[PDB]
Write a protein that binds this ligand. Structure first.
Ligand SMILES: Cc1cc2nc3c(=O)[nH]c(=O)nc-3n(C[C@H](O)[C@H](O)[C@H](O)COP(=O)(O)OP(=O)(O)OC[C@H]3O[C@@H](n4cnc5c(N)ncnc54)[C@H](O)[C@@H]3O)c2cc1C
Ligand SMILES: NC(=O)c1ccc[n+]([C@@H]2O[C@H](COP(=O)([O-])OP(=O)(O)OC[C@H]3O[C@@H](n4cnc5c(N)ncnc54)[C@H](OP(=O)(O)O)[C@@H]3O)[C@@H](O)[C@H]2O)c1
Ligand SMILES: Cc1cc2nc3c(=O)[nH]c(=O)nc-3n(C[C@H](O)[C@H](O)[C@H](O)COP(=O)(O)O)c2cc1C
Ligand SMILES: [Ca+2]
Length: 604
């Protein structure tokens, strides 16, 4: 299957590939594909992995061929896994792509080292190869508002396509269902999905290998509150992976498929007067597509809203639009409709009423009571429930049959006056010591190859997680008689008497000599604030010495402000004691990252 041939046979001329890991690039690519119709074109969205991009040179065979790439960037400016083959292709190929027309929208996050590196590389590479850019590279920023970055970009993409191929707005704009409903009245239980992903019964009859499509149901053997206060809830979990064949190393991530709050799901059924226990199936009206269902079908609505659908984040604009038609009351519909406009008051109303106020789907149906959409249409609009990532807090050398998690429970109050709860954390929190569907995702965050190499670990708050495993492995290495270099932890929290994670464990590790140094910064213990970077600055002399000697630096935690301040402080350090300019120090540090001596495991 050549993607070009498939376009020819299904009559399409616009193909939008998506580089996606948590499914955002997918919806974006899907939304572009459906837009084609308004401009007299026929487009399709596709997963690059399922094809050979070297076929891009056969695109001229289709009249008015146009390829659009929605690419997301991951770990150290790399391609999502489904686009690794494509990336590999782009670097070794020197094929001539004259005649190919393209546009690229990258999904990125300014708070990461290589911002939108994938999108930038694809766009730059296609031009070098000869293709013709039909519109400027799009730079979505998940730190600002990705959605807005998208609709803004889209609004200027279509017109630009219209002007190049000589087409126009068919005017037409009638919401088209992508799936068709079918109720299953006479259905056996052995044929109904109860929340497993991929293969039916995969949860009950567990067989390896276990990965994202076949999660291992680990038993929760330990779940204890790590902090003293009751204002927040930091917890430590231990997951049994015995009999799973799963392997991991300190630094890797453990992902889990949670379930929504059962009461919130019930509230939804009640505000839609829908019997959630009705088994059903949603079939793709495009018989030639691979996505026969938006999620494992057949399955009840309850199972769908609890295990396969994201009903907690703020809905994207295109979702608020389709739902407007179910708003009888004049003023409520008004509200919803505009919320999709590019800019104007509509952008502002969306950011304020939906995003800032953090209104989820229920919250909306509650603040627009006239709005009574059918449960099956909603089930098609909403995004999939994603796996959630946590930095493994254990060393496989010490706990080969157990994966540890250190996490803070997300719970806060919204402007709208509701109590918002985090899906995975509240779900994990209610797990009594009983199963969690998980899988390990390999990372590049790793202890030095040589045990004698020093390590500087900077992890405030839950950022301390991967380091708990690092410390265990380093203590275990001293025990096996190996010589180990210095091991310093720069931890931080608010008050030694409230959120000091693993206080006794770390204190004990230090007493034993495993932890060479334990430096904690309490940000709210005195007048002003003490952060990890301040302690890092004070130790400039020693850190420089270790750094000049070949030490490995690790930073884990808040990506927004922490990661950048800690890095700014390491800049100053190298600049002050390295006898060089700031800009040379920035170079210095950035070189360490490429040598693998300054590793980052940051999130937000
Ligand atoms: C590679 C990686 C590693 C990670 N490692 C860890 C780890 O070791 N430990 C850990 O605890 N977490 C970690 N995280 C964060 C973790 O994956 C989840 O995002 C977190 O546990 C929250 O999930 P949730 O499902 O409970 O929240 P969700 O339901 O997904 O909700 C989260 C969203 O709620 C919003 N939010 C949170 N607090 C507020 C507030 N006061 N006001 C307004 N909005 C708010 C934010 O917009 C946030 O994006 C990691 C993330 C990545 C990508
Ligand atoms: O895990 P978690 O999210 O639950 O962590 P967290 O408790 O929110 O925070 C961990 C620590 O990071 C500190 N911190 C906040 N902004 C920082 C910055 N820009 N640079 C360095 N340290 C910072 C916090 O101090 P404050 O919360 O007092 O700002 C706190 O002591
Ligand atoms: C582990 C991880 C690593 C990331 N690395 C980068 C990065 O290097 N550069 C960047 O611009 N954005 C980075 N991001 C942000 C994503 O690119 C952004 O959230 C995007 O919307 C994800 O798209 P997806 O849902 O389609 O996979 C990262 C996100 C995660 C969870
Ligand atoms: Ca010290």
């Amino acid at each position: 299957s050549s993607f070009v041939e498939k376009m020819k046979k299904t009559g399409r001329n616009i193909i939008v590939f998506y580089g996606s890991q948590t499914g955002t690039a997918e919806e974006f690519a899907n939304r572009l594909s459906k837009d084609a119709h308004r401009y007299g074109m026929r487009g399709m969205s596709a997963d690059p992995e399922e094809y050979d991009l070297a076929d891009l040179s056969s695109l001229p065979e289709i009249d008015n061929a146009l390829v659009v790439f929605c690419m997301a960037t991951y770990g150290e400016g790399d391609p999502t896994d489904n686009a690794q083959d494509f990336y590999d292709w782009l670097q070794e190929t020197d094929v001539d792509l004259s005649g190919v027309k393209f546009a690229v929208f990258g999904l990125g996050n300014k708070t990461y080292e290589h911002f939108n590196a994938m999108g930038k590389y694809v766009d730059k590479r296609l031009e070098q190869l000869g293709a013709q850019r039909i519109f400027e590279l799009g730079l979505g920023d998940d730190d600002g508002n990705l959605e807005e970055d998208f609709i803004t970009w889209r609004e200027q993409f279509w017109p630009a396509v219209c002007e190049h191929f000589g087409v126009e707005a068919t005017g037409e704009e009638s919401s088209i269902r992508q799936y068709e409903l079918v109720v299953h009245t006479d259905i056996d239980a052995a044929k109904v999905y109860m929340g497993e992903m991929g293969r039916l019964k995969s949860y009950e009859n567990q067989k390896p290998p276990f990965d994202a499509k076949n999660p291992f149901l680990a038993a929760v053997t330990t779940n204890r509150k790590l902090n003293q206060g009751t204002e927040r809830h930091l917890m430590h979990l231990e997951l049994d992976i015995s009999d799973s064949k799963i392997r991991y190393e300190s630094g890797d991530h453990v992902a889990v498929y949670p379930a929504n709050d059962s009461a919130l799901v019930n509230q939804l059924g009640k505000i839609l007067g829908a019997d959630l226990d009705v088994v059903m199936s949603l079939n793709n009206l495009d018989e030639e597509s691979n996505k026969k269902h938006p999620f494992p079908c057949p399955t009840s609505y309850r199972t769908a809203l609890t295990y396969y659908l994201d009903i907690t984040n703020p809905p994207r604009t295109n979702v608020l639009y389709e739902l407007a038609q179910y708003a009888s009351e004049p003023s409520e519909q008004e509200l919803l409709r505009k919320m999709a406009s590019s800019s104007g008051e509509g952008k502002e109303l969306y950011l304020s009423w939906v995003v800032e106020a953090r209104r989820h789907i229920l919250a909306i149906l509650q603040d627009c009571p006239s709005l009574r959409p059918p449960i099956d249409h909603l089930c098609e609009l909403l995004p999939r429930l994603q796996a959630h990532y946590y930095s493994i807090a254990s060393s496989s050398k010490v706990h080969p049959n157990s994966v540890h998690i250190c996490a803070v429970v997300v719970e806060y109050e919204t402007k709208a006056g509701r109590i918002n709860k985090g899906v995975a954390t509240n779900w994990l929190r209610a797990k009594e010591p009983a199963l969690v569907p998980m899988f390990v995702r390999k990372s590049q965050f790793r202890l030095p190859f040589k045990a004698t190499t020093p390590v500087i670990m900077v992890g405030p708050g839950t950022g301390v997680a991967p380091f708990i495993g690092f410390i265990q492995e380093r203590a275990w290495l001293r025990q096996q008689g190996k010589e180990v270099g210095e091991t310093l932890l720069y931890y931080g929290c608010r008050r030694s008497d409230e959120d000091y994670l693993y206080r006794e464990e770390l204190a004990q590790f230090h007493r034993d000599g495993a932890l060479t140094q334990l430096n904690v910064a309490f940000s709210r213990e005195q007048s002003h604030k003490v952060y990890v970077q301040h302690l890092l600055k004070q130790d400039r002399e020693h850190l420089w010495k270790l750094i000049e000697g070949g030490a490995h630096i690790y930073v884990c935690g808040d990506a927004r402000n922490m990661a950048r301040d800690v890095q700014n402080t390491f800049y100053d350090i190298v600049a002050e004691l390295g006898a060089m300019e700031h800009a040379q120090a920035v170079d210095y540090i950035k070189k360490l990252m490429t040598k693998g001596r300054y590793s980052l495991d940051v999130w937000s």
